[PDB]
Amino acid sequence: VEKAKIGLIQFCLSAPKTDMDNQIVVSDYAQMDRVLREERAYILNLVKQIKKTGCNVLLIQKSILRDALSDLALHFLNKMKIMVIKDIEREDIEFICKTIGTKPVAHIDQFTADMLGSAELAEEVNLNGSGKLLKITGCASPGKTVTIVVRGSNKLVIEEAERSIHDALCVIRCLVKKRA
Amino acid sequence: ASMGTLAFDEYGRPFLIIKDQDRKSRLMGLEALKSHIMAAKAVANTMRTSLGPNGLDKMMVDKDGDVTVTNDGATIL
Amino acid sequence: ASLSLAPVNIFKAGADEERAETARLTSFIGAIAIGDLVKSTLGPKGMDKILLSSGRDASLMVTNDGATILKNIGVDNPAAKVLVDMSRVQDDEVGDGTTSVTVLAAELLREAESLIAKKIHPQTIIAGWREATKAAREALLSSAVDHGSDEVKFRQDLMNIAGTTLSSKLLTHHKDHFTKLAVEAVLRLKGSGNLEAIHIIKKLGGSLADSYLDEGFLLDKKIGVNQPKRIENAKILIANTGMDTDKIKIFGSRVRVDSTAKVAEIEHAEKEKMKEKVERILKHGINCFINRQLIYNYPEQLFGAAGVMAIEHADFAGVERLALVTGGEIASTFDHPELVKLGSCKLIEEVMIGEDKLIHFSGVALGEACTIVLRGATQQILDEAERSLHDALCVLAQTVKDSRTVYGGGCSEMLMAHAVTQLANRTPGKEAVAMESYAKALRMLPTIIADNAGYDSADLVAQLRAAHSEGNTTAGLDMREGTIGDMAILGITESFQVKRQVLLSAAEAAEVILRVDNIIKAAPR
Amino acid sequence: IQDGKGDVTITNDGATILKQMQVLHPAARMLVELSKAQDIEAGDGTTSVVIIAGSLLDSC
Amino acid sequence: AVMMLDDLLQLKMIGIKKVQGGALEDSQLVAGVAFKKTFSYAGFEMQPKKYHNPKIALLNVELELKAEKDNAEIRVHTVEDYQAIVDAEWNILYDKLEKIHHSGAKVVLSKLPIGDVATQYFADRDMFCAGRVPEEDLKRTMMACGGSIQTSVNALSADVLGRCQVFEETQIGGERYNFFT
Amino acid sequence: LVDIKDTEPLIQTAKTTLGSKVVNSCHRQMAEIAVNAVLTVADMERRDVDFELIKVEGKVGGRLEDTKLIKGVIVDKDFSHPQMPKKVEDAKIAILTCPFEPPKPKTKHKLDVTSVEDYKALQKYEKEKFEEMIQQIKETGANLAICQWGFDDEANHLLLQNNLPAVRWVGGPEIELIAIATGGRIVPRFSELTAEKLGFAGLVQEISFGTTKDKMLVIEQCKNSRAVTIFI
Amino acid sequence: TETKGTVLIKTAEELMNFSKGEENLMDAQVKAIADTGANVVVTGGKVADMALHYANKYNIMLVRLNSKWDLRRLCKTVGATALPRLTPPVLEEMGHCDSVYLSEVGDTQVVVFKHEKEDGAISTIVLRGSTDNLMDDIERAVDDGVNTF
Amino acid sequence: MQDPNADTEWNDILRKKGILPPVKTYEDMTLEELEDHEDEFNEEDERAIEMYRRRRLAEWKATKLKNKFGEVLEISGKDYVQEVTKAGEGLWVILHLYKQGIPLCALINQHLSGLARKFPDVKFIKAISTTCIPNYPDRNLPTIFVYLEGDIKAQFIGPLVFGGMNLTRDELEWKLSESGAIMTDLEENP
Ligand SMILES: Nc1ncnc2c1ncn2[C@@H]1O[C@H](COP(=O)(O)OP(=O)(O)O)[C@@H](O)[C@H]1O
Ligand SMILES: [Mg+2]
Ligand SMILES: [Mg+2]
């Protein structure tokens, strides 16, 4: 995605579900059809309220209670041409927001353009048949945050590369305090 | 002395009257009374030192190792 | 005859019954083993022990605290269990004297073994010991001094007592430093004795002198995501609400409809309920919100949009300490803000300690709560430093409650022994002999204190005994050079509460252990 | 260092070496904690601190 | 003992309690009934323990807040109906208790449990209550005092109530025993 | 003589009984309180003495000389909220076996929410139940509440706000002893609470035990408490 | 119900009246039975506490026969018909006996349905004896005699 | 031995001297399985199949009688003693002590909501720990107690022993069947 507006949502894009024990009681085939129809309408209204802000990249927090992204919501987001990345972890939220400038949205009502983060590119780059990375390059209002990607030919040299880089960073930290 | 009935029949055929008669014991008569009296005497001679103001206590340790120091005969026994 | 050595055994397989001499044998050897274990930790030059647990974790501790050492040992002797429980009770009552009481009980039982060997009934012994305990209590009470009236003299006694408590512990390296800490930490309570108010954070790294008592308060919790990170003139709401998928406590309540549209309307109603709750909160006019329980994503977003710092998951202890340090009221209902008191601190920021970030409340309003940051090179150093600080704070709290003080360095024990000696030489019979043994144990306490440094314990205790017989009731051990001196001048003073409890608990446990003439064990499980 | 499991670690860090090889001796475990404290406070020098401690004790 | 049994000389009509402690001559026969105290709840000590001409309600009735039936399911869609249902459970119980109270019975025995609410209710009315009484002790109380055991509290006439000249709760060797004498 | 005016023959008997025990170090102090205990709790018409009315509680710490008789009750609990006051003089006590929570039928029940109005009605019902409980407790005139079944955050804070110190999770036996001692009646629901069903205690205090964090509640200075506690 | 039963309450009134309705129904059932003249009821299944209450009220002797063969043989004995419903019996469905009583033969308690006529559909031989083995052997001898007849 | 023990006659002589010591049936097929074939069975078999079918029908009707509740319900502390300590005789009880706050507790409650319908014979209850136990520690949830006749049969306590956030509705089912409460038909997969 070029000229990416990114939104990080902490709510779920799936059939409605109250915090209480809810049930939908059917006693007529009319209700049976209306159930699916109204579910589609709910999900479509959600993806429309997301699309209308100009968002084209969508990060979705991880939800273990209920489905954070139904296949219907995925279909609608795809047709709206919005890149969607789910299973974001609840510990990376402060990091992601500090990096991009996004603001986490926990209720669709407050999903406005002012809660997005403008990046100059967001791509999923292949690591020559060794996995894939979702890299966001460029960010307006860039944060006091940076990421280092550590490559290597075996997990042991990689692990010691990580440790060595940590040693160098801790040296520069030992230099920021007690400047001697 | 014990082991209840021991005859095994005069003819030579098995004589089994009580279940586990071979594993069971029995004491009869004056020797039973004497055993009772020795047991009671042991218990009483244990307790008699915890009697009166100058009586001393006993330190009981349970199955899991908790300690109880007492002079109360009911608690001791 | 006898219970065990009888022609018939009266017990289940695995039980046993130790009689008169064998019972006193096991009792005395076990108690004296416990005592010889816990001594050598006694006094300024006492050395630490290693608590190399054999569990699947193999916990490792380095302690000079007698209570901890005895708690963390596998004891099988019942008399030793008695002494262990006695030290635990000492640690509960006051925070010091667990090694002094353990050593005292063990020495009393050693002397009682000697006396039983002399063919004396342990009733004449217990009688004489009760008489000696009376005499010792009166001598202690008569020597005690109270300075709680004079504020400056009270400050001096508090500093001296904290110093005397930390002298024996690993903090004697930087005693003065930690002395000041402990004193300030107990004075910030403003008369209260709540030691749960004093929070101690142990941060690995740094030297032991890098430890300090924060002028404000520190909390190891997190701020929300889109919420501020610095707040001046903070108005604070301390709460114990749900803010976590908050459900109406009616449990039979269930959403039962015929249309997903209604399910969505009811979901929106739930969200609107949470929003109205947050609005009721904000109607208090706050900038910081601390919740005992979690704060889910939607109220997090609301507090962020409102510009409020929402600290979550603070525990019951955390919220109590925050209420004490800021002045707020722990609330769970927000329909009457005029009744909810808010907390105030000049500043709430985020600070770095080691490699972890913490919330720093500075300029707090009340201060009747504290945070002490303990730095150290090893987790064992940190645990022993915290244990020693707990000792010092417990003793200073006990003194603020009861300002009575009594001089240490063996002055108190020697004085009590002198009173017991006067009583003994004026008393007829073998009770005089048991009084003399009581006095010997009291004397054997400073003897051990001196041994642990490497001085002529016999010479020094002889000088002290002669002085206290002469009338110099303030003569005690000066452990810097290894001489005798004036405890009043050197600042070696203890809490009368602590010394009296030491005496009484030791004499009491020795009495109960001496009344035993039979040990009837049951088949172990 | 091949731990109890099949987890392998090739390392030059003193803190990592020490905390990956269960030492089973109170003083050695204290040295592990020392290397940990140096890793916290400074981040490098975790071998030097352990060597200095061992040397001070060999001098004692 | 045997000269009191009526015509079948039932052994179940002779009660034999064994109270550890005391001498054989301290043993006794009560021309009446006696049985051990039965798992009293809170408020039982607030109850009185001696009555001088009590009327006795013998019941097979569970007196406590309980599911009106195990296969019973309440369904309401209104908080007013919720409140009404709560108060309805309470009124059911309190109605049982009020019927038991108005029968004149100052002593109440149930073969089934008597909850803490009922215990405290009877304590406030200065009545005595004992639940979980064993079936045999109940039948003996019936044959001695002269009433009938009632599974329903809706017809508690003096015809079905029992009566004795003295009721007491006394200590017998470490145990507490209720005596209808 | 077994009268309450000449307790010397009874103190002599009790001292003889306690002569052989380790507590003879406080011989008469122990004997006296045993006598007073049995005299406090007894139908003295040569009738029985129910020991359930004597609560024998022990707490490590202190001295044997601290063992005493409390003509009232001791509980192993503290006030429910940490900011409530730790002392209450001339305490009017409401003894309750109802948890301060929204009512719940014992029968299997399902309250159905079918509309946003049903949800809001449920919400306000919960709010108003909590407020109505606290208002009913206040209107009786009580200065202290003692529940048997614990309560929740809203009820706890409303008690604090309304200046109603409260204890929760008190046991059935202790609830009974508090009722017997304070002269109060045990109440199963708030609607049944009145100023006459209340007990009176001349002192309700929270007591500490040094460096422990453990608190106990003493209720004493009752008028004619037929219950008693021996604190060892 | 054979399918499944749930008491669906929706009003405090139904809740207050359900149990009273249950007992009033039981009282009606047993009073219809007693008013047919029945003084003895023999049920092959269980007995409910309320039904027992009302049987005692209306002076009916209740007997419970766990076995089904025992019930069939009792029906043959007394001239009755086993009713699968708790409906009062018609003049033909009822059985009669010159006496029905509880007695104690030895240690054993027994319920006796005894005719006075020297006839009937079933006759019982009460075997007394000092040993269970002896009585089983005498029962075998009785079987031999009956098979000979 | 002096020589290697192998297929030789010397070892055999030594051994002789004393050295060198030397669909099954309609009986198991369920109601569904019985319908599956019906025709397969021979009529001579079908005579006893009638009896086995009546037996299985009786067993199924018994289980229908036994499935009282089949759904998760919440009890307060006050009635706990009646619901758990004095539950139905021989009825397996599973109590989930939980606070709504902890998400792992909510996951366990969802899994229990599923298992309740899956296992209508077992009683499934849930309760707030602070409201069941006076001052139940915060970091000691979720707590799964397994009860029988008022006696505790099992206690999976802790936010770590229970089986981690990856806990599906399968490994919990097995953990509950460890004490033999719900009696699932599988093994511990994860
Ligand atoms: N400077 C000093 N001179 C003499 N004695 C001291 C000095 N500092 C501390 N002490 C003594 O050292 C002892 C320390 O005891 P401690 O190890 O705390 O015993 P416990 O663990 O039983 O409390 C105190 O009894 C005190 O009398
Ligand atoms: Mg000390
Ligand atoms: Mg005696």
Author numbering:
A (entry chain d): 241 to 420
B (entry chain e): 2 to 78
C (entry chain b): 2 to 526
D (entry chain d): 61 to 120
E (entry chain h): 182 to 362
F (entry chain e): 156 to 387
G (entry chain q): 251 to 399
H (entry chain P): 1 to 22, 45 to 212
Could you pull the original sentences from the published paper?
The chaperonin TCP-1 ring complex (TRiC) acts as obligate folder for >10% of cytosolic proteins, including he cytoskeletal proteins actin and tubulin. Eight paralogous subunits (CCT1–CCT8) assemble into a hexadecamer of two back-to-back rings, enclosing a folding chamber. This architecture facilitates nascent protein recognition at the apical domain with a built-in lid, as well as binding and hydrolysis of ATP in the equatorial and intermediate domains to drive lid closure for open-and-close conformational transition.
Intriguingly, another symmetry-relaxed 3D class (20.0% of all closed particles) presented additional density within both ring cavities, clearly different from the first class with tubulin. Another canonical substrate of TRiC, actin, could account for part of the density, into which we indeed built an actin monomer on the basis of its detection in LC–MS/MS. Our model of actin, positioned similarly to tubulin, depicts a partly folded monomer coordinated by specific interactions with the ‘CCT6 hemisphere’ of closed-TRiC state. Subdomains 1 and 3, known as the ‘barbed end,’ are well defined in the cryo-EM density map. Subdomain 1 is localized close to CCT3 and CCT6, while subdomain 3 extensively contacts the hairpin termini of CCT2, CCT7, and CCT8. Upon reaching the level of the CCT2′ and CCT3′ apical domains in the trans cavity, helix H2 is followed by a loop region and helix H3, which traverses 35 Å latitudinally to the other hemisphere of this cavity close to CCT6, reaching the C-terminal TXND. This TXND fold, highly conserved across all PhLPs and superimposable with the PhLP2B TXND structure, contacts TRiC through the CCT5 apical domain loops, and partly through the flanking subunits of CCT2, CCT7, and CCT4.
